[PDB]
Amino acid sequence: LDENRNLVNMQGMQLTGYPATGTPPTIQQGANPAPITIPNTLMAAKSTTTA
Amino acid sequence: SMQINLNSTDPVPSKTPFSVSDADSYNKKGTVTVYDSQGNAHDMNVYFVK
């Protein structure tokens, strides 16, 4: 891991793959691969819709 | 020249009026690079809607 929260191998290269966006996030398979990150930003809540 | 495969059970996109901005407005996106007579690369995107 790295301070930029990139998936970094020993020599500094960043692992590449599909990113995820949304709430809840979903993979954009059609989008070209991008350097994957693991940030520390929290998630927002979703109200109840079924009980 | 470009070759693709398509899904039989793929439905039509939700937002029927086509727009190049939103992903759900189409079914598939592909890219290609074209070179002009000056050495400049342009990106041509093909969009597939069933």
Short mmCIF file of C-alpha atoms in Angstrom, two decimals:
data_model
loop_
_atom_site.label_atom_id
_atom_site.label_comp_id
_atom_site.label_asym_id
_atom_site.label_seq_id
_atom_site.Cartn_x
_atom_site.Cartn_y
_atom_site.Cartn_z
CA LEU A 1 0.00 0.00 0.00
CA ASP A 2 0.97 3.63 -0.51
CA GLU A 3 0.02 7.02 0.92
CA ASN A 4 -2.02 7.58 -2.25
CA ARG A 5 -3.89 4.35 -1.36
CA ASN A 6 -2.86 2.80 -4.68
CA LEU A 7 -2.29 -0.93 -5.05
CA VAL A 8 1.45 -0.64 -5.68
CA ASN A 9 3.96 -3.41 -6.33
CA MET A 10 7.52 -3.23 -5.02
CA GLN A 11 8.90 -1.23 -7.97
CA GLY A 12 6.25 1.51 -7.89
CA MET A 13 3.86 0.39 -10.64
CA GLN A 14 0.14 0.58 -9.86
CA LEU A 15 -2.23 -2.33 -10.37
CA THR A 16 -4.80 -1.59 -13.08
CA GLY A 17 -8.42 -2.63 -13.44
CA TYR A 18 -11.99 -1.48 -13.60
CA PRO A 19 -13.09 1.23 -11.14
CA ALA A 20 -16.37 1.40 -9.20
CA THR A 21 -18.74 4.35 -8.95
CA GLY A 22 -22.17 4.89 -7.41
CA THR A 23 -23.99 4.54 -4.11
CA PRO A 24 -23.87 1.63 -3.75
CA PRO A 25 -20.93 1.56 -6.18
CA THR A 26 -21.04 -0.70 -9.22
CA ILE A 27 -18.35 -1.80 -11.66
CA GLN A 28 -18.36 -0.03 -15.04
CA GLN A 29 -17.20 -2.99 -17.10
CA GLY A 30 -17.40 -1.03 -20.36
CA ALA A 31 -15.05 1.66 -19.05
CA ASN A 32 -11.37 1.23 -19.80
CA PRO A 33 -9.29 -0.03 -16.84
CA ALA A 34 -7.89 2.54 -14.42
CA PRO A 35 -5.41 2.35 -11.50
CA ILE A 36 -7.43 0.83 -8.66
CA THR A 37 -7.43 2.67 -5.33
CA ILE A 38 -8.64 1.89 -1.82
CA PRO A 39 -9.51 5.25 -0.21
CA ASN A 40 -10.67 5.75 3.38
CA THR A 41 -13.79 7.78 2.57
CA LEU A 42 -16.83 6.52 4.47
CA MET A 43 -20.20 5.59 2.97
CA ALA A 44 -23.59 7.30 3.22
CA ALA A 45 -26.70 5.58 4.54
CA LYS A 46 -29.80 4.49 2.62
CA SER A 47 -33.31 4.72 4.07
CA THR A 48 -35.46 1.66 4.69
CA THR A 49 -37.73 0.61 1.82
CA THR A 50 -38.91 -2.90 2.84
CA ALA A 51 -39.79 -4.54 6.17
CA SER B 1 -12.27 -3.22 -39.23
CA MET B 2 -13.93 -4.28 -35.97
CA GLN B 3 -15.53 -7.50 -34.73
CA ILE B 4 -18.01 -7.75 -31.86
CA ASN B 5 -20.33 -10.26 -30.21
CA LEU B 6 -23.78 -9.32 -28.92
CA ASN B 7 -26.12 -10.79 -26.32
CA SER B 8 -29.44 -12.33 -27.32
CA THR B 9 -31.05 -11.56 -23.94
CA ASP B 10 -29.70 -8.00 -23.90
CA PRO B 11 -32.66 -5.62 -23.46
CA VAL B 12 -33.15 -2.22 -25.03
CA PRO B 13 -31.60 0.68 -23.05
CA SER B 14 -33.81 2.37 -20.48
CA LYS B 15 -33.38 6.01 -21.58
CA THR B 16 -34.58 5.59 -25.15
CA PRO B 17 -33.48 9.05 -26.46
CA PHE B 18 -29.82 8.39 -27.24
CA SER B 19 -27.24 10.56 -25.48
CA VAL B 20 -23.47 10.06 -25.53
CA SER B 21 -23.14 11.20 -21.90
CA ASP B 22 -24.92 8.55 -19.80
CA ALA B 23 -23.86 4.91 -19.91
CA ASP B 24 -27.35 3.41 -19.59
CA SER B 25 -28.49 5.30 -22.71
CA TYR B 26 -26.67 2.71 -24.85
CA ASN B 27 -25.76 -0.98 -24.68
CA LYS B 28 -22.06 -1.10 -25.57
CA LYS B 29 -19.14 1.31 -26.02
CA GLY B 30 -16.00 0.64 -28.05
CA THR B 31 -13.02 2.84 -28.94
CA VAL B 32 -10.59 3.21 -31.83
CA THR B 33 -7.74 5.57 -32.70
CA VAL B 34 -7.58 7.31 -36.09
CA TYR B 35 -4.58 9.17 -37.49
CA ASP B 36 -5.02 12.16 -39.78
CA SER B 37 -2.69 13.46 -42.49
CA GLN B 38 -0.80 15.50 -39.86
CA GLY B 39 0.07 12.85 -37.26
CA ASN B 40 -2.67 13.74 -34.76
CA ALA B 41 -4.57 10.97 -33.00
CA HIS B 42 -8.35 11.30 -32.75
CA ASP B 43 -10.46 8.98 -30.61
CA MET B 44 -13.53 7.58 -32.38
CA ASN B 45 -16.06 5.86 -30.13
CA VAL B 46 -18.68 3.44 -31.44
CA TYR B 47 -21.89 3.05 -29.48
CA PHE B 48 -24.20 0.05 -29.75
CA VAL B 49 -27.93 0.25 -29.01
CA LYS B 50 -30.25 -2.68 -29.69
#
